[PDB]
């Protein structure tokens, strides 16, 4: 029944194009292994404050991307961050997690800074307990306003 | 009148849906032939690529439009490094789903309506009914299965070509660095949005195929009525596509926008 | 395109918002691009290239610049070439002869 | 029809596609054609472009008079070629690359001086042109200087 | 037609100060700083009203301001045109002074140039 | 070839127009645009005249349009060749002469040759139609 | 939530963050006349998952995200957090509002 | 390639003859009025029913992205820009190619298969002047009017949705419309609408005149008309968008 | 055809009214009687034609044109004011920022004198001031830093 073999030719060329397009979209554009967590290990971090960090934010080591933030959750002592880091990148055991902002408009991320840059390394599932958060804009604005207001202008 | 027509179309879509397993278990070869025909076109349009070529060209045009307009506006304002972060979002939110829907509607739905109208006029549907064959199950359900099988590769190609066109226009014609574009593209794009967009496109393709099969199955008036059926089906398909995309985007991102830039 | 343009390796204390493919500038004019950026111990090793038409002094300083509020950061060879020995292919620039932008969080702090 | 189905459709197709391509090309660059919109191009020598792009405004006394056409590296300097839109400035005129807005837009400001007419393809000397003081340069200077301050000593001295 | 000042300067329906019971006041500003109509009237930095018309009378601008019912303003209330955000809009703040008076602003009352 | 001859003639005309326009713009930049337009008009006028003659040269030979040769294709080819040749030679001269306003080689070969060819084609078509209609009245009813 | 002023660039839909992570959003803002003085009253719709985590004595601020961005309600834990947990019936106050650019 | 090139040549020759008949022979006012009203009655409710949800979706996306960005007061600028330069002409493309061009192709194919074109031709009448010219002019006129209506309705619906649903400030919407949209934008939108209508009418008429009869020739001709219209109008839209952004308001 | 003609005419009138409304809204078309004045600036700071003219912050006209005078050393701004609004001898002109993107406008201050300025007169450079000139502000911080 049927089997003209021209319909078969169209079917096989369509299947080849389908597989090529789907693989290219999955790997080079959607980055499905990164989203799923293939080839990466899980790490945690504790913060005094989130510092504006959000899920899917970049994880960096001295500014270069080495992973992504999986989740940020409130805790009693601050914020708890769970992230995935590529297994090709190993961070030293004395590293510190610094929340940062790329520019004045936003784009929060987290950086892993280690002064030594060697020695023992963190293992998957561990937590970084030492962290820092940038000074907020609001307190700086309040401090500037008060410092400029206390000056006696008539005396000036 | 209006209620009668609504009841007729509801009965048609119900009977077409309930016969999908029957066509799956009984008409596999016809389903494969229709998959090939929909994927690679038919008639004089099949020599250029059929549906694939039209979808690709229209999606490339839409991506180029996004890149050009976004880069121009952001360069005029000054914050032009966000272009990719803009383009991606557009391609997932408004442009690529609707554009792929309209192009798929035009090509596949108009072809299906023309074929079913020709079969109805040439008494082939009556021939099937005489031979003890469920004409609706044989034709409409097979078209629906072929469309459901073919839509995911088609929308994958559409998304890939839209992204490729936007990136090429932004980073070659406008000479933006590829690293900045890739960073702002992969940083602000969530795979969840792409999955939900694929679900929207699948549902939209099913609705479009049902509408065009309804308009072409009950064609009348000889060869002249086929063109009028094609036009009416196209109008209804455009309306349905836009409405479905609007409702889905309102439902998904109504409360949680799924986008973070500030603190 | 190999050997058509001069490739130079530099070391930075921190490489933020700089990605491969970003432009390399001389006096604000594009002359090349950046090949790769990787971690080198406590430093960061950035390999970039610039077109062989333009000559660069051997004692050049590769400074990372952020042109505006929202822009693509670049690497500029700050001292313009006026003669003498030039920067050869495969040269290495240490942390002493490199510069880093100021960053917004440092300003806030 | 007989006329539509004639045996001359190939030549008609060639002529029509060439005409449509020509029309699209003309519409794309209707303003950039030199045979219709030609103005003399002047040049200046600068120490740095300072974020200047091709097509940025060149203004005399605050009002737009032209655009920036080319930027090249000439030895120790940058040669920037622009147009004045049919206007004439003196050979003693001063050019200044300047930041326009906080988002980083740049433009050239011209202050005409002197009596001698600046001929076409004339080059302003490097001593009559200036480069902007970047906003990021200002932030870098103030932050690096403030980092090293001994604030307790300063407060005690005051 | 004759008084067409633009799409930005035409009154718009809806919002606080447009329903029944809203009171209308005239604010005699020294200048408006390019303020457009339909801008926000804020009490305690809360948007509770709208500016209707910014007609200039005898070369001193007067603003027609509608505020929603249920707001008490002393007759010596201070009016100040300010900026909502750096890359954003402007607004008219109606702030009570340091010495509120017993008498309150009624419908059609005017806030002079001194305040 | 008729189209080759017309293209060579119009390319030489366009080169002369470019040289004169460059000299006039350098002399008086204020009226520069006007000068250019004026010269362009002259160029167009020239083409128009030839087109009219060509129309007569067709309309006398054949009493009906079907027997007439398609002059539109010949004029399109002549205009395209004129634009390409003029752009190429003007770019070549501009390497040794700074008064002309010539862009990069690819631009003069394609983008501005498109403008020259389109203008020449439109003017020639209008001239040929007017020339044929000139003695269309003289044809017996 | 009650405060002296709502703060500019604070409209409904502003994030309410505890320890820097959002827990809810701002629902409405109104002016309440208390002792012949207008105050800003904000109604916050907050997910009850984090309600058991925030202490009763939590500090409330109407802080500013960025120089160009909008404002957000920031909750923090005090020096001596109370055993009781906040709810719809607990009156709360904002400790401070960031100064406007005006 | 030779056969598609020959078809393109036939289309171009037909369009040239249409232009010559328009500029030389007397104009058919009655047929123009009839075709204009037919196109209006076939493509007025669909164009609004497609423009309203599409503009609501665009406004919703822009508002949520900007509110998360922080700059929710500049939504009017993007709204006006998108509605004027892209949304209007694109909705015009869709609802003209789908409805009016297909209806014209079906009508002319019906005339061709019923030998009415031959009936006109044997009487000495050139069917191009009597049929194609009024239909092309009606297509252009209706495209212009529908583009204007689509832009206006889209802007008004976006205003109402953003204000009464997402609680943005109305003054920020209306005072930012002109921030990025000016005379070049409306001019290029008008040019886009006119060209789209003219090309759609020409393609529909040419495909209708050259129908293949049979039992599926009319339907195949209508489908080819629709596909060609979509492709050509998207290409023209890309070219005109590039041209328009060259003459940008902000630059 | 009569009824069809009427329907087509009505629909065409309505939709052309919509198109004209779009043109008026996005082209900033005004329908008021205006009187033309002039002013002289040392630097107009990006002031363009068609930008609004405001008296005490209230829009009263537009900017007709800007040109260079005294060899380009100064800029003459020719603008229009509402005919009902009379300028005076002490009326002064300034150029103010509309936003941080680069949009400007012209601001008029009445002054104190009651001597009405006759129409068509030119405000001298002695009482006209430019805009912020952000580059000068940024460059002035260089010695301070």
From TrEMBL, chain B:
Membrane-spanning ranges: 34-60, 66-89, 144-174, 194-217, 238-255
Keyword Ubl conjugation: no
Record lineage: Bacteria, Bacillati, Actinomycetota, Actinomycetes, Mycobacteriales
Name of this chain's protein: ABC-transporter integral membrane protein
Source organism superkingdom: Bacteria
Keywords of this entry: Membrane, Transmembrane, Transmembrane helix
UniProt GO molecular function: phospholipid transporter activity
A GO cellular-component term linked to this record: ATP-binding cassette (ABC) transporter complex
UniProtKB/TrEMBL annotation, chain G:
Keyword Cytoplasm appears in the UniProt entry: no
Domain (Mce/MlaD) ranges: 1-75
Superkingdom to which the source organism belongs: Bacteria
Protein name (Swiss-Prot/TrEMBL): Virulence factor Mce family protein
Alphabetic keyword roster: Membrane, Transmembrane, Transmembrane helix
A GO biological-process term: biological process involved in interaction with host
Residue window of the full protein shown: 53 to 154 of 409
Cellular component aspect of the GO annotation: extracellular region
UniProtKB/TrEMBL annotation, chain H:
GO cellular component: ATP-binding cassette (ABC) transporter complex
Organism superkingdom: Bacteria
GO MF assignments: phospholipid transporter activity
Keyword hit for Transmembrane helix: yes
Keyword Zinc: no
TM region(s), chain numbering: 5-23, 44-67, 140-166, 186-206, 226-247
Keyword set, alphabetical order: Membrane, Transmembrane, Transmembrane helix
Pfam short name (any one): MlaE
Classification via PANTHER family: ABC TRANSPORTER PERMEASE PROTEIN-RELATED (PTHR30188), PROTEIN TRIGALACTOSYLDIACYLGLYCEROL 1, CHLOROPLASTIC (PTHR30188:SF4)
Protein name listed in UniProt: Conserved hypothetical integral membrane protein Yrbe1a
Source species: Mycolicibacterium smegmatis (strain ATCC 700084 / mc(2)155) (Mycobacterium smegmatis)
Gene behind the chain: yrbE1A
From TrEMBL, chain I:
UniProt source species: Mycolicibacterium smegmatis (strain ATCC 700084 / mc(2)155) (Mycobacterium smegmatis)
Domain of life of the source: Bacteria
GO biological process, one term: biological process involved in interaction with host
Occurrences of domain Mce/MlaD (ranges): 34-111
Gene Ontology terms: cellular component: extracellular region
Protein name listed in UniProt: Virulence factor Mce family protein
